[PDB]
Amino acid sequence: ANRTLIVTTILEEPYVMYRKSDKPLYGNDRFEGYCLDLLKELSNILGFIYDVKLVPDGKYGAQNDKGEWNGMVKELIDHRADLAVAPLTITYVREKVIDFSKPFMTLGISILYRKGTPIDSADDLAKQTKIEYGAVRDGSTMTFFKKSKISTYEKMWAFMSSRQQTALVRNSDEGIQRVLTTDYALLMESTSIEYVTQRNCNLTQIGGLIDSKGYGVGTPIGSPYRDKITIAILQLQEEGKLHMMKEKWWRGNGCP
Ligand SMILES: CN[C@H]1[C@H]2O[C@@](C[C@H](N)C(=O)O)(C(=O)O)C[C@H]2OC[C@H]1O
Structure with missing residues (x-):
C-alpha cells in the first residue's frame, strides 16, 4: 500500500480544532475543521491515507538571524512531513524553500x-x-x-x-x-x-x-505530490467544494 503521508498542521480555528466528544478520540479523529475536510477531499482524489501531526514548536514558520527556519516550514524543509495542510500563507520567501500548491483560499x-x-x-x-x-x-x-x-x-x-x-x-x-x-x-x-x-x-x-495573498498546501521542494495536490485543489475550486467548505466552517451566528 501507498505509504501513509505525514501531515504537519497547527491548531487554528476554524481550520484545525480539537473535536469535542464525551468519548475517547484517537489519531486523526481528534481533529476537525476546514483543513481536515480539505484533507478528506484531497486524499480521496490522490488515493492516500494520512497521519495528522501538530507541529512540535507550535509555529507556522519564519527565519532567524542565521536564516534557519522553524515551524511547519522547517518540518517540510527537513522532510519530517510530506504535506503541510494548514492556513499556510504563500509568500515569496517561503516559495524559495518549499513547493506550495496553488491557493485554496485568499486573504x-x-x-x-x-x-x-x-x-x-x-x-x-x-x-x-x-x-x-x-x-x-x-x-x-x-x-x-x-x-x-x-x-x-x-x-x-x-x-x-x-x-x-x-x-x-x-x-x-x-x-x-x-x-x-x-x-x-x-x-x-x-x-x-x-x-x-x-x-x-x-x-x-x-x-x-x-x-x-493565498493559503496553499506546503510540500518539500521536489515533492511528487505538489502538482497532484494543485490539480485536486483546482478540481475542488471548480466544483464549488471549497466555497461550500468555507461556508460550513465560517457560518453562524452573527454580530451587527
Ligand atoms: C490563520 N490566520 C491566523 C494565523 O495566521 C498567521 C500564520 C500565517 N497564516 C502563516 O502562514 O504564517 C499569521 O501570520 O497571520 C499566524 C496567526 O495569526 C493570526 C491569524 O492571522
Whole structure:
C-alpha cells in the first residue's frame, strides 16, 4: 500500500480544532475543521491515507538571524512531513524553500481591535501612542512587517521588534485575549478576523486589507505530490467544494 503521508498542521480555528466528544478520540479523529475536510477531499482524489501531526514548536514558520527556519516550514524543509495542510500563507520567501500548491483560499492582513476608537487604518495605528500592537510570532504577518519597505510598516516593525518580548504573541488566542483585556491591536489575516468578529461582538476589523495573498498546501521542494495536490485543489475550486467548505466552517451566528 501507498505509504501513509505525514501531515504537519497547527491548531487554528476554524481550520484545525480539537473535536469535542464525551468519548475517547484517537489519531486523526481528534481533529476537525476546514483543513481536515480539505484533507478528506484531497486524499480521496490522490488515493492516500494520512497521519495528522501538530507541529512540535507550535509555529507556522519564519527565519532567524542565521536564516534557519522553524515551524511547519522547517518540518517540510527537513522532510519530517510530506504535506503541510494548514492556513499556510504563500509568500515569496517561503516559495524559495518549499513547493506550495496553488491557493485554496485568499486573504489579506488587516487589524483586529475592540470597538470605539477613531483608529481607521494602519497609518492611524502607527501614528497614535495610546494603543500598542503586534502579531503572532514567526508567521507570515510578522514577516510581512519585518520585510516591508513601506514607511508606515517599517515603523510598525521597529515598534513590534522593540517590544517583541512583549508585542509578539505565541498564537491567535493569546493575541485575541490581549486585544480583549489590554490596549493592544492584533495584526491578523482577514479570514481569521471574519471568523472571530462574527462570534465576539466586542471585536472589529480596523481598516481594509493591506495586502492580498493565498493559503496553499506546503510540500518539500521536489515533492511528487505538489502538482497532484494543485490539480485536486483546482478540481475542488471548480466544483464549488471549497466555497461550500468555507461556508460550513465560517457560518453562524452573527454580530451587527
Ligand atoms: C490563520 N490566520 C491566523 C494565523 O495566521 C498567521 C500564520 C500565517 N497564516 C502563516 O502562514 O504564517 C499569521 O501570520 O497571520 C499566524 C496567526 O495569526 C493570526 C491569524 O492571522
